[PDB]
Every structure is written in structure tokens, then in C-alpha cells.
Ligand binder design. Structure first.
Ligand SMILES: COC(=O)c1c(O)cc(O)c(Cl)c1CCC(=O)Nc1cc(O)c(OC)cc1O
Ligand SMILES: COC(=O)c1c(O)cc(O)c(Cl)c1CCC(=O)Nc1cc(O)c(OC)cc1O
Lengths: 217, 215
């Protein structure tokens, strides 16, 4: 259940963290962007697979803040990942050599990271820990967690609560506490969701005080 | 041949690098202290083993600056390490649980107290190489950039006889440690109380090079 990252991934995390410390908010752009890719995938699969969406009919991204627990959640109903895919996709990597060289050489790298598709790791810019809960049509719900020094995968004792999809949960660093404020999240989400072809919601309040999903794009 | 560090070691390296960020020269103190501890060990073994010192009759620490190659070498003739010991002592970590918590909660003394000062070489080095020859094994080489490490049989064979050479590929901004003046100075400070003789390969005035005793 306990694994170690591939060497090149440790290097990649360091390059990303060191070259973006000046524009941390980008982590949110990357999470929403990965959410959108996952949503496109299940959509492509639903063209050939008639049972594709049976686990969860919607195709959405739902963002929620939990100030009391110091948590930020970003949930999408994309294709999700199997246990083997969590271990492979997040703990290893496969023209990587050049990318690292370009990153190192460049060291703006915001565009580089997006183009290569390794934006997930920019989550370590604001999080002391990253948790990935996923449910893929071909497997049971699993959980991936990491503080960047190793990672582990376990079967989710809660069972299948996602239906289909992925939740990226971030345990925010103390200095990243500002991302727990609704005003800030709504503003960032709105900016980074303008060109995403799937509805994106943020759990927010409204005037008694009532909480409910608020469309951002 | 390729290995990954234990999770605890990765955490430890970060804790050590982030706390001593303002007093980097301390890496030299730790390398010399570890050198010393390796010598005490072979000295002890030699008390109960007539052939202990057969591979190399001396008990010393020799420091060498290779400016051109950007390398710093620290060689001792202690007990050395087998292939299995390089992998275990350097890639895994002992009351570690509490130490990490204590580090998190000055760290200079703490690191010295737990004996994990080796990792402070990463404060001034982009890559760290450890060549070692133990009586019970052939010479091997351990190398790391901190993101992983590998251990290979030393193709040069037994050149140490017995002992360990710590080789640091100095970061561009750590280049100051390649100056004889500076290393001589630091060595003289952290060697005042080391029971074994410590030498620095230095020049004297024509210009000749030779071992100069610093303690
Ligand atoms: C499979 O895509 C996902 O389910 C998904 C998601 O829905 C939200 C996310 O924030 C992320 Cl990170 C993912 C996984 C994206 C992916 O394709 N995995 C992946 C991630 C990497 O960092 C990577 O680095 C080389 C390679 C990957 O395949
Ligand atoms: C075995 O001791 C050595 O031969 C030696 C040496 O001669 C010079 C050195 O710079 C070092 Cl690091 C060593 C190894 C010291 C040791 O006993 N191993 C060791 C080193 C660590 O850094 C450590 O960290 C948790 C644990 C160890 O056991």
C-alpha cells in the first residue's frame, strides 16, 4: 500500500514548486483543467460505451471550502482512475527528459506545465498534503494520499460514494489559508473556468442564510 | 542498483536543509565528525582483531579541493561500509520518530546529537558521492542528487584500502569552499578537538603541494 515516487517525479515536483512560488494561484487553474480533461475522456468513452454514465449521470466540477477543517475539495464526474492508474499516473511519469531540461532552462513555466499536462503537482505549492479519492467504472473506490515524501493507495472504507469521478482534497499550508475564503475561490474559479466546456459550481451561501451550488461559468 | 529513499529520510533532508539554510559551513563540521566516528570504530575493532588495519595502516582524514572539477573530497580511513551498509545507513533511518518532531518543533546541535549530519552536505552540494571500502566487502560507490540514489561496484577496484571518501559536487554559489584559505580555516575550527590527525592538501612556496596538518 506504500509506494515511493519515481526519481524524475521528485525532480519535477521541485522544479514546479520552485518556478511558480510567485504565482501560486495557478494550482487552481491546473486542478480545474485536469477536471475538464477527465470530463472529456468519459464523454469520449460514452460515444462507444452505452453504460458509460450509469454510475453518475452528470458531467460537472464542484468546488467546496471547509474552513474549520482547513480543506479545499475539487470534485469532478469524469472517467476517474483505477487503483493501478492512481499508482501509475501520479507516482510515475512517461518526452519527459526534455521537459525537465526546458523547465530547468526556463528557471515563466506556467505554460510549460500546462502543455505537458503535469499541473497536478502544483498542488504542493499550497498544500502540506494532497488526497485523491477516485472511482472508475472498472474498479472500486480508492484513495491516494501524499505529503510529497512518499504516497499510498488504499481501498476506500466508505465504499462507492462518488459513483464515478475524482475528488482532489487539499490540506492547505498555513500560509495558503486565504484560499479558504469564498470571495477568493469564487474569483479564481470564475477566471480559470471561462473556457471550460463543463459547468463549474462552488458551494456557497446566499441571503436566512442558505448554502447551495452556485454556477460560475 | 537504483533505490528510493525511505519516506523518513526525505522528510529529514528537508528539515535539515530548511533549518540550517543560514549556517551552511556546518556541513564541514558534520563530515569531519562522521569521519572521526568511523575512525573510532575501526580503532575499537582493531582492539579485538589483529587484521583490522591490514587494508590501510593509517588512521586519518584527508581533505582535498579540486577547483577545476568543482569537487570537494573528504577521505577517512575508518571502518568503511559494505554495499549493504551504504544502502541501509544512507537510504533508511535508529528514536527517529521523536527527533523529527523535535526538529520540527536552533537545529545545529540536534543534528549533531542524533548523528544525521551527513544530509547537510546537500546544503552546499547538487550531488553527493560516497565511495567506501569495508573489510568484509569490495569497494562500492553510492551516489545521489537527493531524488534517489544508486549503489554500484567501484570499477576502479580497491583504491581506498579501507575507508570512505565523501565527494561533493559543489553548487555554483558554494564555490567559495574550493579556496584553500577558506577550507583550511573551517577545518582548523572544526578539528580542534578531533582525536585523529586531519590533513588538507595545500600549496606552499616555486609552488609545491603537500599534506598540511590542521589539528
Ligand atoms: C484521469 O484524470 C483524472 O481523473 C484527474 C482528475 O479528474 C482530476 C485531477 O486533478 C487529476 Cl490530476 C486527474 C489525473 C490526471 C492524469 O491524467 N493523471 C496524470 C497526472 C500526472 O500528474 C501525470 O504526470 C506525468 C500523468 C498523469 O497521467
Ligand atoms: C559508517 O560510518 C562511516 O564510515 C562514515 C564515514 O566514514 C564518513 C561519513 O561522512 C559518513 Cl556519513 C559515514 C556513515 C556514518 C554512519 O554511521 N552511518 C549513518 C549515516 C547517516 O547519515 C545516518 O542517517 C540517519 C545513519 C547512519 O547510520
Amino acid at each position: 500500500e506504500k509506494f515511493a515516487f519515481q526519481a524524475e517525479v521528485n525532480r519535477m515536483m521541485k522544479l514546479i514548486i520552485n518556478s511558480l512560488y510567485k504565482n501560486k494561484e495557478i494550482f487552481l487553474r491546473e486542478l480545474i483543467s485536469n477536471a475538464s480533461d477527465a470530463l472529456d475522456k468519459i464523454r469520449l468513452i460514452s460515444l462507444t460505451d452505452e453504460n458509460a454514465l450509469a454510475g453518475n449521470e452528470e458531467l460537472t466540477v464542484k468546488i467546496k471550502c471547509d474552513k474549520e477543517k482547513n480543506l479545499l475539495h475539487v470534485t469532478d464526474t469524469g472517467v476517474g482512475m483505477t487503483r493501478e492508474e492512481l499508482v501509475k499516473n501520479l507516482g510515475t511519469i512517461a518526452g519527459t527528459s526534455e521537459f525537465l531540461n526546458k523547465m530547468t532552462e526556463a528557471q515563466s513555466t506556467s505554460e510549460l506545465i500546462g502543455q505537458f499536462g503535469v499541473g497536478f503537482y502544483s498542488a504542493f505549492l499550497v498544500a502540506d498534503k494532497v488526497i485523491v479519492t477516485s472511482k472508475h467504472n472498472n474498479d472500486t473506490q480508492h484513495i491516494w494520499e501524499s505529503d510529497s515524501n512518499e504516497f499510498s493507495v488504499i481501498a476506500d472504507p466508505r465504499g462507492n460514494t462518488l459513483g464515478r469521478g475524482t475528488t482532489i482534497t487539499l490540506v492547505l499550508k498555513e500560509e495558503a489559508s486565504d484560499y479558504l475564503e469564498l470571495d477568493t475561490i469564487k474569483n479564481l474559479v470564475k477566471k480559470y473556468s471561462q473556457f471550460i466546456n463543463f459547468p463549474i459550481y462552488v458551494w456557497s451561501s446566499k441571503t436566512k442564510t442558505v448554502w447551495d451550488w452556485e454556477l460560475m461559468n
